[PDB]
Amino acid sequence: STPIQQLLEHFLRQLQRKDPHGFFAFPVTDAIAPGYSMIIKHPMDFGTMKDKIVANEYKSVTEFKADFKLMCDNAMTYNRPDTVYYKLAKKILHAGFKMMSK
Amino acid sequence: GGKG
């Protein structure tokens, strides 16, 4: 486990605590979100991010932050503003970037 | 719409 992986695993646990219901925990399927694979070209979720840390696939916090922002941007694109998913995505994107930029 |  490198010092960079450890940093990223710490950031991921803290980000996942902001999603207590697990809405971002695993990939969104078309069965639960009709037309999702048509609308969202580059899906992302926390479980995929955790796997990428473990695989040593992030070179920097910067590349980690981009996967987090992609996850949140996808939820704000697919879901209408007045939904629980849109609201959480907008909220945790802002609070998560602030947390990582302290 | 979306997830309902």
Swiss-Prot record, chain A:
Signal sequence, start to end: none
UniProt-annotated site: Histone H4K5ac H4K8ac and histone H4K5bu H4K8bu binding, residues: I32, Y85
Region (Histone H4K5ac H4K8ac and histone H4K5bu H4K8bu binding) residue spans: 77-79
Domain Bromo: 1-102
Subcellular location: Nucleus
Quaternary context: Binds acetylated histones H3 and H4. Binds butyrylated histone H4. Component of the multiprotein chromatin-remodeling subcomplex SWI/SNF called GBAF, which includes at least BICRA or BICRAL (mutually exclusive), BRD9, SS18, the core BAF subunits, SMARCA2/BRM, SMARCA4/BRG1/BAF190A, ACTL6A/BAF53, SMARCC1/BAF155, and SMARCD1/BAF60A. Interacts (via N-terminal bromodomain) with acetylated RAD54. Interacts (via C-terminus) with RAD51.
Record's function text: Plays a role in chromatin remodeling and regulation of transcription. Acts as a chromatin reader that recognizes and binds acylated histones: binds histones that are acetylated and/or butyrylated. Component of SWI/SNF chromatin remodeling subcomplex GBAF that carries out key enzymatic activities, changing chromatin structure by altering DNA-histone contacts within a nucleosome in an ATP-dependent manner. Also orchestrates the RAD51-RAD54 complex formation and thereby plays a role in homologous recombination (HR).
Domain statement: The Bromo domain mediates interaction with histones that have acetylated lysine residues at specific positions. Also recognizes and binds histones that are butyrylated.
Name of this chain's protein: Bromodomain-containing protein 9
Gene label: BRD9
Parent-record interval covered: 138 to 239 of 597
Swiss-Prot record, chain B:
Record-listed N6-lactoyllysine modification sites: K3
UniProt disease link: Tessadori-Bicknell-Van Haaften neurodevelopmental syndrome 1: An autosomal dominant disorder with onset in infancy, characterized by poor overall growth, microcephaly, hypotonia, profound global developmental delay, impaired intellectual development, poor or absent speech, and characteristic dysmorphic facial features, including hypertelorism and abnormal nose. Other variable neurologic and systemic features may also occur. Tessadori-Bicknell-Van Haaften neurodevelopmental syndrome 2: An autosomal dominant disorder characterized by poor overall growth, microcephaly, hypotonia, profound global developmental delay, impaired intellectual development, absent speech, and characteristic dysmorphic facial features, including hypertelorism, abnormal nose, and wide mouth.
Similarity annotation: Belongs to the histone H4 family.
Subunit and interaction comment: The nucleosome is a histone octamer containing two molecules each of H2A, H2B, H3 and H4 assembled in one H3-H4 heterotetramer and two H2A-H2B heterodimers. The octamer wraps approximately 147 bp of DNA. Found in a co-chaperone complex with DNJC9, MCM2 and histone H3.3-H4 dimers. Within the complex, interacts with DNJC9 (via C-terminus); the interaction is direct. Interacts with NASP; NASP is a histone chaperone that stabilizes and maintains a soluble pool of Histone H3-H4 dimers.
Protein name: Histone H4
Native species: Homo sapiens
Record PTM N6-(beta-hydroxybutyryl)lysine, positions in chain: K3
Function as written in the Swiss-Prot or TrEMBL entry: Core component of nucleosome. Nucleosomes wrap and compact DNA into chromatin, limiting DNA accessibility to the cellular machineries which require DNA as a template. Histones thereby play a central role in transcription regulation, DNA repair, DNA replication and chromosomal stability. DNA accessibility is regulated via a complex set of post-translational modifications of histones, also called histone code, and nucleosome remodeling.
N6-(2-hydroxyisobutyryl)lysine found at: K3
Subcellular location field: Nucleus; Chromosome
